[PDB]
Amino acid sequence: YKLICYYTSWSQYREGDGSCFPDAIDPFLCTHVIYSFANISNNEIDTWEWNDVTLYDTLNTLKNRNPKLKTLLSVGGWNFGPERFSKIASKTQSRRTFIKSVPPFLRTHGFDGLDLAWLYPGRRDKRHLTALVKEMKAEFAREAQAGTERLLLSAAVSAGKIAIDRGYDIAQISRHLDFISLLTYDFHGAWRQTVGHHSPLFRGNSDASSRFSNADYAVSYMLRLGAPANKLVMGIPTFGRSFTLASSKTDVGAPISGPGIPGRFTKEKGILAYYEICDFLHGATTHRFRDQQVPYATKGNQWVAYDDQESVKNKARYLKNRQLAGAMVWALDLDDFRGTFCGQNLTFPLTSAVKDVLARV
Ligand SMILES: *[C@@H]1O[C@H](CO)[C@@H](O[C@H]2O[C@H](CO)[C@@H](O[C@H]3O[C@H](CO)[C@@H](O)[C@H](O)[C@@H]3O)[C@H](O)[C@H]2NC(C)=O)[C@H](O)[C@H]1NC(C)=O
């Protein structure tokens, strides 16, 4: 069982305790840690924050306390134009230049692999996406000839039926990717105004349309398109999505006027870190969609959908019963990394819960 964990580079800037560096990571918690978002310039992989070289180095030293740890660097992300990616993949000339530029870069900074986070391929990208992966892996097999351990190659994929049908050739890229991470937590549309859970586990007996929006369906679909169970990694949120109610209605279906208010440390509308949700929970009413098996809390005119220890152990068991390769946790830095915000003196509550379940059988 794999436990891929993402560490986001821009979490250093957060004020107070909110600040997180490679430093705070438990060497023995995850199996793969993915440093989040490198850039591309002149069709060549490159750093993003000025001190990426120092943090790169800082993270890669964890491999000194734990030999078996493996780290990878991710390319793209949400603040990286889709188009920008799409331009590089279409022109074989500019694509080969990018591919040729990765090995070196990783070997120098100490990573054991690359992670592609092209955030959403369009109908016109599917063919090139397949080209990019295919060729990139060929490059990695060829470079292992130099007598060093072959670099890994993976990818962050959407879990939206429509998104997959539109831009991914799952059967084709499944064979060159070392492992695939399903973004099973972006389900409730950024578009419409209705309270809903972004990462539901199950269909949920009460609501006909868009059953395609839950981890279970996303997973069953990928297996059908051709992805091997031994390459799928299911995504698990370590954050919550907030909304500002537009009425005293709190139950499934209630009106919304927009995202929720900012977090004191997170400072971003609509999102809250797990440690912020821990402080928010005080004096809030909790609820739990029994059909989907996922939380939600309300307080004042704020309605928050999130994941606790139990909702997370649940997804972990599911993951196991379908025999998937493992779990993926988005943001170690959104988890209670210090462990001084959520009751129990434990550190990394959620990611640990996933790990305990994974080490069972
Ligand atoms: C990831 O890589 C991007 C592509 O290289 C970087 O971008 C830009 O490259 C230049 C420089 O900023 C931009 O054009 C600017 O350059 C000069 C400064 O010499 C300015 O005078 C001019 O006004 C422009 O700002 C381009 O806009 C841009 N290329 C694009 C956007 O297509 C980008 O900085 C980098 N991202 C980060 C955070 O490193």
If you had to describe this structure to a student in words, what would you say it looks like?
- This protein has 361 residues and is α/β, with parallel strands linked by helices.
- Helix content is 30%, strand content 23%.
- The protein contains eleven helices and 15 strands.
- The longest helix is centred in the N-terminal third of the chain and has 18 residues, at 92-109.
- The site of a molecule of 3 linked components (NAG-NDG-MAN) has 3 residues, from loops.
- Chitin binds at residues 49-50, 76-79, 120, 183-186, 241, 330.
- Keywords: Antimicrobial, Apoptosis, Cytoplasm, Disulfide bond, Endoplasmic reticulum, Glycoprotein, Inflammatory response, Lectin, Secreted, Signal.
CA radius of gyration: 20 Å
> DSSP helix count?
11
Topology, number of strands: 15
Order of helices and strands: EEEHHEHHEHEHHEHEEEEHEEEHEH
Distance between the termini: 10 Å
- What overall geometry do the principal axes of the alpha carbons give? globular
Judged by helices, strands and strand pairing, the structural class is alpha/beta
Bound molecules: a molecule of 3 linked components (NAG-NDG-MAN)
CATH C-level class of the largest domain: Alpha Beta
CATH architecture of the largest domain: Alpha-Beta Barrel
Q: What is the total domain count?
A: 2
The major beta sheet can be summarized as:
8 strands, parallel, barrel
CATH superfamily heading of the largest domain = Glycosidases
InterPro entries: Chitinase_II/V-like_cat (IPR011583), Chitinase_insertion_sf (IPR029070), Glyco_hydro18_cat (IPR001223), Glycoside_hydrolase_SF (IPR017853), Glycosyl_Hydrlase_18 (IPR050314)
Subunit structure: Monomer.
Organism: Capra hircus (Goat)
Protein name: Chitinase-3-like protein 1
